[PDB]
Design a protein around this nucleic acid. Sequence first.
DNA 1: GCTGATGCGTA
DNA 2: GTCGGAC
DNA 3: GTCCGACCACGCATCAGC
Length: 637
Amino acid sequence: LDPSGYNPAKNNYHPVEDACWKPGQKVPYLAVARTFEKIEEVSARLRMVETLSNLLRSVVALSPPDLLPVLYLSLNHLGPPQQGLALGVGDGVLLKAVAQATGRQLESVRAEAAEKGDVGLVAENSRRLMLPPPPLTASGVFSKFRDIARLTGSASTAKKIDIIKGLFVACRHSEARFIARSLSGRLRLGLAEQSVLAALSQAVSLTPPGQEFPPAMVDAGKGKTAEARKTWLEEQGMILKQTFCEVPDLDRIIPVLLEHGLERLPEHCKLSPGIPLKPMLAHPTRGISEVLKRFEEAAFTCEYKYDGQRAQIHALEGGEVKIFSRNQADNTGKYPDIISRIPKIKLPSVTSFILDTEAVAWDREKKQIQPFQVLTTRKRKEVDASEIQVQVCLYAFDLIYLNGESLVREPLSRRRQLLRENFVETEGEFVFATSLDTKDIEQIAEFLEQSVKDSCEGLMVKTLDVDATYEIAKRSHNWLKLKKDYLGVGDTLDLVVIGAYLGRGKRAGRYGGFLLASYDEDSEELQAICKLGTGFSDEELEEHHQSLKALVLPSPRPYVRIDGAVIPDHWLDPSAVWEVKCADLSLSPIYPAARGLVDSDKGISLRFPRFIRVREDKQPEQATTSAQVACLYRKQS
DNA sequence: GCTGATGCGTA
DNA sequence: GTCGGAC
DNA sequence: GTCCGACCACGCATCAGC
């Protein structure tokens, strides 16, 4: 019963006979590290989910109290999202911790990190007393995380490091690697919230919980054919997934799960205001072409695409209001002005609601929307409604809860109707999305032109009646986003490659990204405008490594200016011209491209740049000019 | 008390 | 946001 | 088509080091 050889990958896995801790005992972390180890070793999701489910099966069998930590460890989360825990541990610290844990120089082990592309294997390969401290447990290592996440104030980083040295010198075998990876936030397991859910639902279904030990019922799949066992699990699979969608808070599910069992969960775990839900999202479309096929025979509506923050507004019985972002973080304290205007936006009939809206930066003096970059300069922290400098206008466009009742399983027509009926527009505080419902291949295209005129990113397009319900389990991108840059219309740039960046794991070794530049005629310089790491195939990314290998330089050219950009690992004789696409342009505090052209102190950078195509026809001389770029940014009114 | 390095969470 | 890998 | 882990600018909050 040694865990150094534990194996949930095994075949005909017996939850008890194959475990590596006697029952009731605390689950070793090495089990987890092993599980993780056997997961990282295949690449097929369907294997990975069973191998996790094996660990879970045992955990449910022997040590039920450790189920929650084990799941949180596998998610690399610290707890429910709306509590806002955060490690506050970076690569910088994590390293200091490793260096102190082993001996070497900070820049020594730092070097080992940036050319292995992963701290986890810097951690463990490095050689911690004559005594091995007693071995790490999953409950403990979880609770050492939260301990790191609670420390704050002066000299908090010291204490943070100090716990990490502990964990490390107590690590055996591969633990020091997955511990290092979790704390760096890049667990990069291969399975996420979805698969962990798949594995958990397989595990309680295979090895049902609450059994008096030893459990009579170990594999509850035995009496079934393959076809039977498979669509059985998928069924239970969808029980857990959907229920979690409505209530995505493990600390409340896992108890209930354990007591009344999986199939009865959806009657104790009701969608309720006060718990942040993951919002519904969409999918791009090439144009009003791809529209009429995905939607086919179903009336749709058309809504403005708003360049703001999605905010999801919860209203309990008894007046407590809380406001949540799309990541389920609590944003209430961030928005006191909206907590105050609540009574002015509901009919006093309304006792409880959940609203799907989009907070946009709004100018009062001129009655017009300001772009997202302005909005981002709100204070996050505990505000006082007095000192708001950047007003915000809410754009409500759906309804999930109304007076005790969940509207999830009901069509958008209905959902919009009740929203139109119980809530009240007040211009530049709270309105409905500017809309149209219509099907004409032309008047739609006229409405987009008018939206993008209004300082909006494009058009949302939502089915009114067919499939137009909200349930984000069976799908979670079920409307369509008609942009302008998804279209031949989208305005690209041709920019110059002036350096390269070494990659991180899954791209460590090869070039991970590039720093690009625009040509400034007046000073004759190349000014770095942004970095680029998105959207070349692995093969194209070596086409580049082989066509830039000749051009590596030890020093920048003198006519290249990057200001406070990240220094490339490999500077590059300036030769390669790529076609780059971006959503919008922005006023950069660190990029010199076109500085002074549009603002006394800030050049311009690209939000969300992706690489499209190389341009062999263009020399660095014919790329986009900083003059042209300044003109581009202005064209965003 | 301030500043630079950076973690985190908006896009 | 949108990407490619690998199923 | 789905899931996963990447990539990016930017600004507020936080803390070590001065």
